[PDB]
């Protein structure tokens, strides 16, 4: 498997267990810290990262009933500039630029405790596919899913039903949408850490999954495996490969990755594109930092980029 280097630039530093990149309508960057603690407990973070100084700025550190959340992932909507931000203590919220936010579900469609969340994605149908490899939520003792197959797949639909399309994972964590050339939602990847698999299934529709199966081999024996991932234009998903130091890339078929990326650290943790460019900002764990470098072409489309009101 060929393996190329390309230059990490340093973007930012000090940000405990740094990871959901993600960037707003506006173009502002953001990353979480989910392993920022007060006392021994859960004080995790939300935070709007200066692009031109590196300077930080926590805009939002979520509590519920004094439970302190562990943001995770992220991911920009659309008809309002918001993110929807996966916390492994407190499921999913949706948090505001000036920093505050609401806790989306406490319980699912079925009327089961929600789990903690640790990344999402959007469809270009505005649906939100997510991850739990947490147990239930806060106030429940926090669990995760490292050892025993009890994360969960949700899907947080447009008519607002927090759908759980899936459970046994051990550690469901990155998660993908491929769509076909017309936009229409056709694939779900989803990343089990440890088993060093990559998971597929066929869309259907709105929390409608079908077929699962096992689309994609994560190189190496070390204690890690996949973490966050995303689509470039040419559907070529690029995965993070937690204790491998490379950022692995697959075809739009899966199997074998068919080149990796070397990294100037040991734990990639999640990666995106800044808008209509090259540039991949990766978080990583090793130093809690976060870079960014240029890949071979434009990022896919996010779903906070397309028009609802446009003619094409
Ligand atoms: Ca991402």
Same mark, same amino acid.
């Given at each position: 498997?060929?393996?190329?280097? =390309?230059?990490?630039?340093?973007?930012?530093?000090?940000?405990?267990?740094?990871?959901?990149?993600?960037?707003?309508?506006? @173009?502002?960057?953001?990353? !979480?810290? =989910?392993?920022?603690?007060? $006392?021994?407990?859960?004080?995790?973070?939300?935070?709007?990262?200066?692009?031109?100084?590196?300077? #930080?700025? !926590?805009?939002?550190?979520?509590? !519920?009933?004094?439970?302190?959340?562990?943001?995770?992932?992220?991911?920009?909507?659309?008809?309002?500039?918001?993110?929807?931000?996966?916390? %492994?203590?407190?499921?999913?919220?949706?948090?505001? /630029?000036?920093?505050?936010?609401?806790?989306?579900?406490?319980?699912?469609?079925?009327? +089961? +405790? %929600?789990? @903690?969340? $640790?990344?999402?994605?959007?469809?270009?149908?505005?649906?939100?596919?997510?991850?739990? =490899?947490?147990?239930?939520?806060?106030?429940?003792?926090?669990? +995760?899913?490292?050892?025993?197959?009890?994360? &969960?797949?949700?899907?947080?639909? /447009?008519?607002?039903? %927090?759908?759980?399309?899936?459970?046994?994972?051990?550690?469901?964590?990155?998660?993908? !949408?491929?769509?076909?050339?017309?936009?229409?939602?056709?694939?779900?990847?989803?990343?089990?850490?440890? /088993?060093?698999?990559?998971? &597929?299934?066929?869309?259907? @529709?709105?929390?409608?999954?079908? $077929?699962?199966?096992?689309?994609?081999?994560?190189?190496?024996?070390?204690?890690?495996?996949?973490?966050? %991932?995303?689509?470039?234009?040419?559907?070529?998903?690029?995965?993070?490969?937690?204790?491998?130091?490379?950022?692995?890339?697959?075809?739009?078929?899966?199997?074998?990755?068919?080149? +990796?990326?070397?990294?100037?650290?040991?734990?990639?943790? $999640?990666?995106?594109?800044?808008?209509?460019? #090259?540039?991949?900002?990766?978080?990583?764990?090793?130093?809690?930092?976060?870079?960014?470098?240029?890949?071979?072409?434009?990022?896919?489309?996010?779903?906070?980029? /397309?028009?609802?009101?446009?003619?094409?």
């Amino acid at each position: 498997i060929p393996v190329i280097e =390309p230059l990490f630039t340093k973007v930012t530093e000090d940000i405990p267990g740094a990871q959901g990149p993600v960037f707003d309508k506006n @173009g502002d960057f953001y990353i !979480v810290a =989910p392993e920022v603690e007060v $006392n021994g407990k859960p004080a995790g973070e939300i935070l709007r990262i200066d692009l031109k100084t590196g300077k #930080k700025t !926590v805009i939002c550190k979520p509590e !519920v009933n004094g439970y302190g959340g562990i943001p995770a992932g992220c991911q920009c909507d659309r008809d309002a500039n918001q993110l929807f931000v996966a916390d %492994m203590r407190l499921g999913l919220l949706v948090v505001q /630029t000036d920093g505050t936010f609401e806790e989306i579900a406490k319980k699912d469609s079925e009327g +089961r +405790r %929600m789990q @903690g969340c $640790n990344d999402c994605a959007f469809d270009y149908e505005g649906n939100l596919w997510i991850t739990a =490899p947490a147990g239930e939520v806060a106030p429940a003792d926090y669990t +995760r899913s490292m050892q025993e197959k009890f994360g &969960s797949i949700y899907c947080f639909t /447009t008519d607002g039903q %927090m759908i759980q399309v899936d459970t046994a994972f051990q550690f469901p964590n990155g998660i993908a !949408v491929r769509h076909m050339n017309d936009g229409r939602p056709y694939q779900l990847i989803v990343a089990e850490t440890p /088993t060093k698999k990559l998971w &597929s299934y066929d869309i259907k @529709g709105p929390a409608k999954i079908e $077929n699962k199966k096992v689309w994609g081999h994560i190189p190496g024996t070390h204690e890690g495996g996949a973490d966050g %991932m995303d689509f470039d234009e040419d559907n070529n998903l690029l995965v993070a490969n937690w204790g491998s130091s490379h950022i692995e890339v697959f075809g739009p078929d899966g199997g074998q990755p068919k080149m +990796r990326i070397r990294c100037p650290f040991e734990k990639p943790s $999640n990666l995106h594109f800044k808008p209509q460019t #090259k540039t991949i900002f990766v978080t990583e764990h090793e130093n809690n930092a976060v870079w960014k470098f240029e890949w071979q072409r434009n990022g896919k489309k996010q779903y906070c980029e /397309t028009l609802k009101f446009g003619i094409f």
